[PDB]
Nucleic acid binder design. Structure first.
Ligand SMILES: [Mg+2]
Ligand SMILES: [Mg+2]
Ligand SMILES: [Mg+2]
Length: 116
RNA sequence: GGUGGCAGAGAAAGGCGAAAGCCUUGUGAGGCCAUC
């Protein structure tokens, strides 16, 4: 149900980046708080898992991100996404709120996301 | 308890059970507010 294919090296970079931002910035795990952050203009980068069932849970997020000028990327499993964020290791979506020390790796990854 | 609104937790909570253990929880546990 993805809107564009994300190659594995980008998914790997996105998740490694989320692990680092966890340490010095601010992350939100879960679709209700991810959606809220997007709507409030506070999300820097949104992660959407591809194995979300029922898929309607995350179906509105890509469009809302585009309307809010928020870049978003898909990753393979909500388990990988949850583990990268920490805490309870499952999440259908997540958002970076504060970039911490990773502004340059994030901007470089979003450049690649637009390239797709 | 119903409805509406917050917030965000797994070395974690609440539910059921004599017990074994099971159920539910970032797909939102406990909690808070308003309202019926
Ligand atoms: Mg009810
Ligand atoms: Mg309800
Ligand atoms: Mg509600």
């Amino acid at each position: 149900y993805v809107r564009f294919e994300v190659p594995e090296d980008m998914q790997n970079e996105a998740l490694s980046l989320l692990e680092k931002v966890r340490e010095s910035g601010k992350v939100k795990k879960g679709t209700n708080r991810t959606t809220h952050a997007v709507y409030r203009g506070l999300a820097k980068l949104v992660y959407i898992a591809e194995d979300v069932d029922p898929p309607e849970i995350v179906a509105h997020l890509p469009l809302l991100c585009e309307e809010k000028n928020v870049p978003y990327i898909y990753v393979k499993s909500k388990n990988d996404l949850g583990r990268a964020v920490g805490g309870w290791p499952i999440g259908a979506s997540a958002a970076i709120i504060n970039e911490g020390e990773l502004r340059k790796e994030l901007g470089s990854l979003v450049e690649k996301i637009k390239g797709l």
